[PDB]
Amino acid sequence: IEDALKVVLRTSLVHDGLARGLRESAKALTRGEGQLAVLVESVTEEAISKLVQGLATENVPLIKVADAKQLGEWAGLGKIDRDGNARKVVGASVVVVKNWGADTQEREILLEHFSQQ
């Protein structure tokens, strides 16, 4: 569901858990750091997503949310001073959650479900 994703992104934004990008994401996945990964399939030439898959194959669970620009928007990359979006364009190709921070029950049931697949 949509709720657990925003909850986990908030809990990793406040405690610096988001590997906002792909190089930091790749380094976190290579290390014992990246506990979750959200990436978009609407990526040109698709090789970055394939490389990410590989990173998660070796810290396993991944999420397949679309709308890269929207993904960055609700990923907290924006300063979002006003109520509405105050920046033209901002987005993230890959988001990696390292620090689980605060825990909510619905989100943990969701991550167990996505682990079960």
């Binding site: 792909l22 290390r31 394939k50 490389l51 590989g54 990173l55 194959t57």
Partner: protein, 74 residues
């Protein structure tokens, strides 16, 4: 009182060193082994730990994190 003139320089210019940005930089560091295993084209640094890639320029490999203390000939 002071009588100062416009300064004249016998130097053309020194320009700010612009960082060499690379698009699609990260993927060149790795290599997908046909929908499955993946390898790394660069070498891993021992002092920092897993993940950090060595820098090969010529007959040596160089680090970025502990950059100063690691420069080992190939």
């Amino acid at each position: 009182g002071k009588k100062r003139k416009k300064k004249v320089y016998t130097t053309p210019k020194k320009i700010r060193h612009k960082h060499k940005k690379v698009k699609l930089a990260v993927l060149n560091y790795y290599k997908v082994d046909d929908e499955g295993k993946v390898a790394k084209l660069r070498k891993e640094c021992p002092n920092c730990g897993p993940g950090i890639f060595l820098a090969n320029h010529g007959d040596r490999f160089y680090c970025g994190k502990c950059h100063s203390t690691f420069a080992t000939q190939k």
